[PDB]
């Protein structure tokens, strides 16, 4: 009737944790000329076999609003963008007064022809040049005459992006380092917070396109059964409402003008690439959304919001007036940065047909203050040629603001709100393979990794090797990957050192001389080896775990030797 | 070098009696040189009392 | 003084290097620093009073 502690190595027990993740890309996905801004050449090529092990009898609490993976992805995207722009031309000589004339189309001065005096590569020669700029890039200086300055030159240094750096989003996979795993929620209509029943284990996640846009989510992924309204509290209108669509809505954005690309040499080894002449007429950049498809998209959204917000009248408003970078829809495609008024999409009351296409006006801005940050700015060089965007609308970010009505507006906060839309299904967990259980002695279908997590302690103990095998295996990703590898090695070696002290370094399961104390768990073996999962068992003895290890070191080898 | 470690410390009261004022001269975008403008009050020597 | 003229002067360090200005937000107040042994090594301390 006496029980003794037994040490099990390879236990399918995991706990919520934060850790540095690494990137993977599908093949090189470059021609050696694009030099993608996301540094995809430094990522590990993906494994063609995605694994994907469904965990039976595992229900796990997920919370998309406290997911460390979102904060880490946002940090990595900012770090990569800063590292990419760093080795490029700094446009410090351009904080000069611009003499700008309005360009008369054959808009109302949207393109200005600005002349200015700058140095050449020879420093002692001063050249008068001209360039075309968008109205949003030039701010009046002093009075209302033709004198202008660049929007941010007075407070920060504008860095010209290197013309060889592509901004095309390419799907990026975030794989966890050895010793950690990513759990995926496979529920068809997941609320975004709460227990998930269909949980699978996957070392990497699907490809995520790091698309930078606001108000409307582009590309990414769609819902499987219906439009899902996520949000956090819903009563508190301060929280962002993330809307995932079932079907995509095609959005055809374009810039019709055919500008030239004039290279103005600024100094030794440095050139400014700007817009030269306009070939053809001047036509407004715009975006086409099918009217009927958007109509049904809002019909589905209003139905779901009405269900969530009780039977109130839903009214959609456009954003307030203000700086285009704040209040307009924004996106980058083709290498060009578009800002669109987005006022024809949220202008209706649903309660309880002039044209079939919604054409949104858009503007182009070359000086972009991205990531809601000031003190740094980028100049976007001209692309040359017409731009065809042809993107998919797959989700919305809505915010909420009194006669029995609720007002929703396009909006959202920082870019983390977009990453949640893709990361809502994933959680990062740390593996702790070493567990202890009572046994009577003194001193299968090949389920995949953690497939026994929902199994009883018995039968789960027959898969210790499956979990055991997954403990192993100068830029942003290089050093982080090296740190992850060293830390995984340290974790493995620490577990091996503990087993070596216990004398179990060569054993997956070892029985010690320490008797089981009934104060730890006054339960029979049938009450422990059946019914309980390893997760429940580690929870029940968590507050006593440190005591058991002490006895093993205090006894066994310390005396047996 | 002879390092002398004392049994008891000796209190040293050092003062810079002048107040001055601080002015910013801009050098470039977002950056400035910080220097003294006009001295307020009398000119008194900085000194230490032991 | 950079010339016989008794009204011409230059920064003391200018002629040899570019002078870096300390950021005013940086405090120079000393804070206790402890050195800790890395894994594989140990730090011994002598407790002899004299």
């Amino acid at each position: 009737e006496k029980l003794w502690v037994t040490v099990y190595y390879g236990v399918p027990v995991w706990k919520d944790a934060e850790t540095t993740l690494f990137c993977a890309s599908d093949a090189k996905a470059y021609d050696t000329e694009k030099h993608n801004v996301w540094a995809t050449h430094a990522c590990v090529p993906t494994d063609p076999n995605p694994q994907e092990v469904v965990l039976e009898n595992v229900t796990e609490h997920f919370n998309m609003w406290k997911n460390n993976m979102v904060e880490q992805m946002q940090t990595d995207i900012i770090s990569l963008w800063d590292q990419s722009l760093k080795p490029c031309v700094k446009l410090t000589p351009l904080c000069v007064t611009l003499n700008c004339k309005d360009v008369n189309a054959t808009e109302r001065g949207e393109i200005k022809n600005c002349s200015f005096n700058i140095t050449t590569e020879l420093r002692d020669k001063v050249q008068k040049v001209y360039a075309l700029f968008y109205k949003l890039d030039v701010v009046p200086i002093d009075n209302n005459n033709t004198s202008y300055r660049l929007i941010s030159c007075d407070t920060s240094v504008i860095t010209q992006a290197c013309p060889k750096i592509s901004f095309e989003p390419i799907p990026i996979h975030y794989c966890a380092p050895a010793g950690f795993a990513i759990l995926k929620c496979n529920d068809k209509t997941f609320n975004g917070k709460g227990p998930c029943k269909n949980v699978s284990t996957v070392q990497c996640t699907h490809g995520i396109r790091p698309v930078v846009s606001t108000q409307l989510l582009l590309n990414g992924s769609l819902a499987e059964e219906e439009v899902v309204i996520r949000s956090d509290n819903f009563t508190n209108n301060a929280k962002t409402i993330i809307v995932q669509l079932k079907e995509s809505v095609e959005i055809n954005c374009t810039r019709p003008n055919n500008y030239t690309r004039k290279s103005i040499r600024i100094g030794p080894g440095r050139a400014f690439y700007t817009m030269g002449e306009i070939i053809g007429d001047i036509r407004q950049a715009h975006c086409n959304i099918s009217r009927a498809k958007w109509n049904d998209t809002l019909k589905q959204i209003v139905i779901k919001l009405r269900e969530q917000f009780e039977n109130k009248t839903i009214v959609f408003n456009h954003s307030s007036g203000g700086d285009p970078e704040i209040v307009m829809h924004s996106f980058n495609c083709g290498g060009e940065f578009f800002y669109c008024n987005s006022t024809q999409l949220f202008n209706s009351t649903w309660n309880n047909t002039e044209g079939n296409t919604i054409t949104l006006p858009c503007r182009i801005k070359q000086i972009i203050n991205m990531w809601q940050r000031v003190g740094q700015a980028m100049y976007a060089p001209p692309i040359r040629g017409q731009i065809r965007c042809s993107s998919n609308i797959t989700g919305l970010l809505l915010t909420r603001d009194e006669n029995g009505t609720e007002i929703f507006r396009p909006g959202g906060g920082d870019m983390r709100d977009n990453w949640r839309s893709e990361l809502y299904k994933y959680k990062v967990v740390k593996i702790e393979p070493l567990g202890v259980a009572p046994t009577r002695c003194k001193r299968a279908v090949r389920r995949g990794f953690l497939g026994a997590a929902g199994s009883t302690m018995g039968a789960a103990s027959m898969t210790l090797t499956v979990q055991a095998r997954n403990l192993l295996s100068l830029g942003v990703w290089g050093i982080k990957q090296l740190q992850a590898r060293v830390l995984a090695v340290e974790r493995y070696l620490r577990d091996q050192q503990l087993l070596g002290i216990w004398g179990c370094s060569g054993k997956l399961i070892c029985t010690t001389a320490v008797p089981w104390n009934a104060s730890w768990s006054n339960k029979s073996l049938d009450r422990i080896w059946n019914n309980m999962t390893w997760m429940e068992w580690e929870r029940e003895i968590d507050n006593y775990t440190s005591e058991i290890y002490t006895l093993i070191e205090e006894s066994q080898n310390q005396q047996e030797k | 070098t002879i390092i002398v470690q004392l049994k008891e410390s000796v209190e040293i009261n050092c003062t810079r009696p002048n107040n001055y004022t601080r002015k910013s001269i801009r050098i470039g975008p977002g950056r400035a040189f910080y220097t003294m403008g006009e001295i307020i009050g009398d000119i008194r020597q900085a000194h230490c009392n032991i | 003084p950079i010339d016989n003229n008794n009204t011409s002067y230059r920064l003391i360090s200018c002629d040899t290097s570019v002078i870096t200005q300390a950021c005013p937000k940086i405090s120079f107040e000393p804070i206790p620093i402890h050195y800790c042994a890395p894994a594989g090594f140990a730090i011994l301390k002598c407790n002899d009073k004299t």
Partner: antibody
């Protein structure tokens, strides 16, 4: 330690021009963004506008842009001239210094405030 | 012209507890949010600069934090002198608007 002090009339008529001076004591009008902020009674703070110190360029809040002129009249004083006042403009007006140089403690916050002058618009 | 909402609009607490004040921007602003303390009859004092950092001379009890649209000011071990109206300010985009402010009373 630079201090600022507002000076001006307490009452202005509903159709006259309001002129408020801000003196600088232990300092001068150096290369910071010198600005004015309004506090209507019972309300939060409203920005009026700022003027630079490196040059004479100014930047006013759009909603008051056509009603506000800010100039510097001497190294130790600058002033706010707000035309076409109305009853809605009754407020405590604060003078302050907006620090923009990053290497200091206020990377972007009004860091030296005055004491505040109450201006009442009435007949 | 980003509009700011602060919550709660009226706050009270005993000496020594830990309290929070939430400031919400209509639009995302990164970390460019300041916090100020205005005592009755006096001009406001700067407490928090870019969302999380403190002004020298302000005790560690006043901690900030947050980014994007949700910012908080946490006042631990609240003392009798920490009475007055707290304001948040947007440094991201001109006009640098302010919230209406939350009054903190001592009980």
């Amino acid at each position: 330690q630079v201090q600022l002090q507002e000076s001006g009339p307490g009452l202005v008529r509903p159709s006259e021009t309001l002129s408020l001076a801000c003196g600088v004591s232990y300092g001068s009008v150096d290369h910071y963004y010198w600005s004015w902020v309004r506090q209507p009674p019972g309300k939060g703070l409203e920005w009026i506008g700022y003027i630079d110190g490196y040059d004479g360029a100014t930047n006013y809040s759009p909603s008051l842009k056509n009603r506000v002129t800010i100039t510097i009249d001497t190294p130790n004083q600058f002033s706010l001239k707000m035309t076409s006042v109305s009853a809605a403009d009754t407020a405590v007006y604060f003078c302050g210094r907006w620090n923009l140089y990053d290497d200091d403690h206020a990377y972007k916050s009004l860091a030296v405030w005055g004491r505040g002058i109450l201006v009442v618009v009435s007949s | 012209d980003i509009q700011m909402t602060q919550s709660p609009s009226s706050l009270s607490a005993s000496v020594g507890d830990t309290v929070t004040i939430t400031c919400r921007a209509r639009h995302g602003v990164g970390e460019n949010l300041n916090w100020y303390q205005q005592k009755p009859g006096k001009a406001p004092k700067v407490l928090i600069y870019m969302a999380s950092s403190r002004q020298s001379g302000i005790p560690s009890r006043f901690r900030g934090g947050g980014s994007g649209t949700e910012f908080t000011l946490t006042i631990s071990s609240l003392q009798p002198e920490d009475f007055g109206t707290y304001h948040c300010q947007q440094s991201y985009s001109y006009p640098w608007t302010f919230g209406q402010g939350t009054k903190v009373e001592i009980k």
